Amino acid sequence: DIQMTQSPSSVSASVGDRVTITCRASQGINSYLAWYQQKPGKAPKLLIYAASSLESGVPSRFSGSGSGTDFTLTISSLQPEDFATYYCQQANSFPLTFGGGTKVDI
Amino acid sequence: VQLVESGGGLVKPGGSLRLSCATSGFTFSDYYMSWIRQAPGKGLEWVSYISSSGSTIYYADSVKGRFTMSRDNAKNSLFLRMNSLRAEDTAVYYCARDQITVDREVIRAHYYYGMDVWGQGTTVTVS
Amino acid sequence: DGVGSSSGNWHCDSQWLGDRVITTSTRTWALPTYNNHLYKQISNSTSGGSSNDNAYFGYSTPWGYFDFNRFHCHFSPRDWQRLINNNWGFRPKRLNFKLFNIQVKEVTDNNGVKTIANNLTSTVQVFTDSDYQLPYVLGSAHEGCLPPFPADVFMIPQYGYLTLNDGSQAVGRSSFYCLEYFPSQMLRTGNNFQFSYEFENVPFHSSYAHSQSLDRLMNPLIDQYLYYLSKTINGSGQNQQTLKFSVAGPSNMAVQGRNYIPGPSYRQQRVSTTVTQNNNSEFAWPGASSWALNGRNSLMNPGPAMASHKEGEDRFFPLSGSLIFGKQGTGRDNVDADKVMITNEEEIKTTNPVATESYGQVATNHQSAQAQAQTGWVQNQGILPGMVWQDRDVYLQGPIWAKIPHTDGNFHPSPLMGGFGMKHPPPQILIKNTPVPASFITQYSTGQVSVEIEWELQKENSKRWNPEIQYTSNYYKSNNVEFAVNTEGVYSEPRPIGTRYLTRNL
Amino acid sequence: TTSTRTWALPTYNNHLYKQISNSTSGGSSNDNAYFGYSTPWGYFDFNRFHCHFSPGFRPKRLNFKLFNIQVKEVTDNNGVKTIANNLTSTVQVFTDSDYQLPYVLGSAHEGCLPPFPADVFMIPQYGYLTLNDGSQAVGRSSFYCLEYFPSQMLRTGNNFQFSYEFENVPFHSSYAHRNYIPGPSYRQQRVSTTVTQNNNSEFAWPGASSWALNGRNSLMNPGPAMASHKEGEDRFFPLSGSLIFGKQGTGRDNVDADKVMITNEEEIKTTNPVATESYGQVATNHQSAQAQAQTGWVQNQGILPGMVWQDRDVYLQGPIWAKIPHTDGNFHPSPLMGGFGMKHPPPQILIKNTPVPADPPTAFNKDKLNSFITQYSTGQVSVEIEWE
Amino acid sequence: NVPFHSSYAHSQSLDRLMNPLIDQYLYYLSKTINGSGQNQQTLKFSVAGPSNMAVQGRNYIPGPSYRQQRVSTTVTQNNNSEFAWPGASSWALNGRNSLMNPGPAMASHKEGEDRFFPLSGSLITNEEEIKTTNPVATESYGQVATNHQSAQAQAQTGWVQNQGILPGMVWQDRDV
Amino acid sequence: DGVGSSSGNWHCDSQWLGDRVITTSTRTWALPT
Amino acid sequence: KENSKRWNPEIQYTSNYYKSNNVEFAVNTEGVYSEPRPIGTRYLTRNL
Amino acid sequence: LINNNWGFRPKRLNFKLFNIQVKEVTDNNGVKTIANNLTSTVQVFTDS
Amino acid sequence: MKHPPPQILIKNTPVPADPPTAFNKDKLNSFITQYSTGQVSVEIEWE
Ligand SMILES: [Ca+2]
């Protein structure tokens, strides 16, 4: 099945910094990629769906791009709320797979 | 929109456990549901996926043949029945729903945009 | 009448009166000069003609034409909802067309800037072919239709036709048509054009779904008086042959005698929405069902009216069986599955066979003590006496009418892409810019076009006790509302809307 | 023709409407799955030829009468049962002339008026089916309450009558007989009345011609109109090809071959293909110096321009009319079990006994009354039909 | 009262009735795999248009067919066997096999081959005029799917030798 | 009138005709003391 | 009568299509009739 | 009514009582019997 | 008022620029720059 890789595994940043998280698939998944942010003790939240589309309610700073094998998640002007683990999942074909995750570090 | 999982418990290996998801705030029949679990200290792992009708169900290779996913439309709830529970089945189990609502007029995959709404989840420990 | 006097108004509304509906649509159009006022021979050779199936020969004309043939041109999404929820049937009755407020323009270019000005003495040639002497291209489901949103200004499509070809070359029987050879009215900035058209009698399109299935029409409480063969053997062993006859009844409903059978089928290959269920090979063309004509293969599209899938299998669709529309802003070539809208034909499952299933089985031999009974699968079945079927549904984005090809014979002329088949459809309406010689002056025209259609309704008297299925907007928060413009002003139709919601008895 | 019979109408389902399905009957099979309702109403069925006839043509007019209403109450004390007249009770009757109810009169069911005028017949219970998914129902399923239709109520002195005019249909052909060719064929398996000629395996269902509709397999019965057998072979009959009638006293299930009457369609051989035989041959290739001309058999054939055919014959015991389903299109609507196809056939005639409750309690209770007086009605029914 | 006999030849063919200059608004399935190799599956869709005219949606289809064996006027092209009767299309009525003559009205031959003629479909008069709406008497009517494709099973088609009437068919009768 | 003649019929119907709807409901009742 | 000029479709009371043991607003196996939910009168829209 | 209308209100009422039946419940020992009483009446008035 | 003086809506009818000369599917986004001026008079009888 299709595997997902997120580099870097973890990242540390200051408020206001620009953070980029990148994950790529073993095989092309078209534009069907979703980004999830999870906070400890809470269920995951969907920030970006279908590679470049931003889920409602989600802040303008969050963004995403890429197609085929390579995808990227970008956070610009990072806030206090933004520190958590982030997962990218390919929604192209079953079984749905998730990336290892990136933990943004204060 | 709200998903509430219940029925999580501590059970010995080989035990049978049934999880439920009570849903409110959205039409239950318009969405495809999926169970997703997260082993402690590890990334989330997809488990099963069921059609709005409940006619079509998909499973992960690991859980195939022992887990049954069911759907009751009249009283909104989603059920996962777990038989032959083994050691690494211990996870926080999440009830989630597809972002794309089922539209009868068109034939399409509903999982393309991911899962917008997730339940709090129920812990399941096997020992 | 005058340069400073408007020759028409903007009439854009629908009136619901009793058993009929009157829709009126006005749009704004622009007419370029095509082919530099020339008739030009075209062929696959100009296109490159990689295959004989795509080989063609024809002519491109300087003329444009008006196409209102889509349902969205005359119906708003609300009006369409009003009609499909409340009515068992509808059909067109009268047609009133108007072309007015003509504004011809002359384009002059100096250096890098182009300056546009009025030309008050120029004319615009418009005529309709009401004897149907020209090739009829309006039943081919082309673009260039009046826009669904009334505030959109649209560009008139160029007229063109095809005649008999041999490869890229023509034959002695091929025809050439000069549209100048027709009488036509010439309009300046004060002239207007109008005509009325009477739809010929057609059956109401059936906007409903059967509440019964063709095979369940029986009384569940009562036995038949017919018998069927229950047992051909008494048990396991040699020489066990016997004849036993059970009566057909509620317990076994499959064996009962029936007066009517489902309609014809031409099997389509099924393709799953979830791709990993599909075969890892290219079967779009090689696995398709087609029909050959004079040595040229043509895909069978959409084909006979059949159910898109069996109950409980929503993911599958016929390879060329259903109508596939585009979403707003979708590319032309090799778009992803999310981009398109694949219509569902499930409402006709009660009386029509599934497009991806065999019609049934037939005996392929004579059984005997030597030979077992053998059955083959029916991949295609023609019309049989005692068949009943539903025509393909019409959609808000879909075509309305087609022209019945003029022939010695036809069967059930209702067009396969849906809508109303007609021997004399609404006539083509041709338009061009009358050339002004300078080599000519670069020129275009702008105008207002209004079309009004009277629709006849068929109400339901139904006695059903429980509530129906209705088309409804979902009530949930969303960034946009369905069937409305977005922040950038782009109107979009998020979904196809079928016509079948209400139910009838079979 | 004019017929008069005596009927008896009981109380079905104890004045209740009830959901039914193959889950209520325990049927596992998917082909036999169904969903529907049973109604307290009964109905009259004269759709068989024997009701109007004793031992070309086509119906014209219809006149129906219901009279001599006698409503009986039944009381049981200990072992004995006492029957008494109830003079104030009513019997409800109406016809569906808008064809708004599911039409069950074309399925060749039982409960028809007796062929012998001295027989007293029991009125059959009315029920219908709706769309089903397995045993469950879908949202498109419709429920009908017949109490929602206006109906005439009859005490013992009241009578009921109405008349119906058959719509134009072609004369039924009752005779026995290149620019033209024989009609279409859908092949049936050939079964022999001499058992030793038959294969020693069970092929009733496995070797039968069928048609699939929404994932369910329906037997092809009786099927398109085709000759039963070639000239000279009378020992063969199509497996699902011909109508089979039971003899008087024949059991319900698994009767021997001598208990049933198998009709033959030998008369239509002149214009129709044999049911158990292939339609013909077609070239399967392009011949050449290296390739021999090859042919293949036509097991099933549809309509072709230039075909002619005869319909299926009608019998004294067979059905008269059917209702053409309401559809966008049809071809040769004449029903396959025989008879006259009609879009507006003779309307269904529905009848039930009005419930008379027992003593209600002396303190108000909101629940519906489940206690009633055991009751039934009986009477005379007459139907008059003009034939051309 | 009879209908007028048609004494004209269509100047158009049933499949070319489209406007050659304009795309359809309908999509077809263009590509089922991304590239060569394992686990490549995808659904790509394209607009039907002038460049590819075979895949466009059409409202009407050619008439019914019952195939005739193809026989050449050049004796050396034909097979060296007696196939007059054995390879001839026929219909059976009450045990007696009747040759199909002339049969349903169909084009005698494809465009470019005038040496071939239907074995029993010809009155040798030529029926090439009706090809515009009618299938060739010696050709299959078309292909149909014979199976459900899957990850295990390739999509399989099969040839239609005879096709009865379908709704939406148009045809020409035989010429006088 | 009399014992053996019905004094009314069963009328359950709904009619839609323009701006008006006519509902009609017939039920069976039992009255104790 | 409703004479709205609203362009986009309304919200309408509808019966859901899904496989279920009973039909809403119908009798069950025992013949008991039941009304599954309370139905309001307010679906169509007006300007304020 | 709800799907296609902005408003409604009742106009005319029409009421009918018919096919009255009066039963008498004679009880002897432990057995209760029901029979028609043809001479009994039912009092019905409306308060207008 | 339940039926106040009605709204009076006005716009300039769009006049497009030169079309591309080869048929395009999209709506026309290029228009001629335009505006309009006029005299408006309203009369009301007061009691
Ligand atoms: Ca549909």
Author numbering:
A (entry chain L): 23 to 128
B (entry chain H): 21 to 147
C (entry chain C): 219 to 656, 669 to 736
D (entry chain A): 241 to 295, 307 to 428, 476 to 686
E (entry chain B): 419 to 541, 560 to 612
F (entry chain F): 219 to 251
G (entry chain F): 689 to 736
H (entry chain F): 301 to 348
Give sentences copied directly from the paper behind this entry.
In each map, the capsid was well ordered, while the densities for the Fabs above the 2-fold axis could not be interpreted for model building. As for the 3-fold antibodies, only a single Fab bound to the 2-fold region, in two potential binding modes, resulting in distorted densities during icosahedral averaging. For the sixteen 2-fold binding Fabs, this strategy resulted in maps reconstructed to 2.54–3.56 Å resolution. The localized reconstructions with C2 symmetry relaxation confirmed that only a single Fab is bound at the 2-fold region. In all maps, the VH and VL chains are well-ordered, enabling the building of atomic models. The epitopes for the sixteen 2-fold Fabs comprise VR-III to -VII, and -IX of the AAV9 capsid. On the aa level, all 2-fold-Fabs contact D532 and Y706. Furthermore, for all the 2-fold Fab-complexes, movements occurred in VR-IX near the 2-fold axis. Additionally, at least two Fabs showed the presence of a bivalent cation in the binding interface.
The AAV vectors are composed of non-enveloped T = 1 icosahedral capsids, consisting of 60 viral proteins (VP), and package single-stranded DNA transgene cassettes. A major challenge for the utilization of AAV vectors in the clinic is the presence of pre-existing neutralizing antibodies (NAbs) in a large percentage of the human population. The presence of pre-existing neutralizing antibodies in large portions of the human population poses a significant challenge for AAV-mediated gene therapy, primarily targeting the capsid leading to vector inactivation and loss of treatment efficacy. This study structurally characterizes the interactions of 21 human-derived neutralizing antibodies from three patients treated with the AAV9 vector, Zolgensma®, utilizing high-resolution cryo-electron microscopy. The antibodies bound to the 2-fold depression or the 3-fold protrusions do not conform to the icosahedral symmetry of the capsid, thus requiring localized reconstructions. These complex structures provide unprecedented details of the mAbs binding interfaces, with many antibodies inducing structural perturbations of the capsid upon binding.
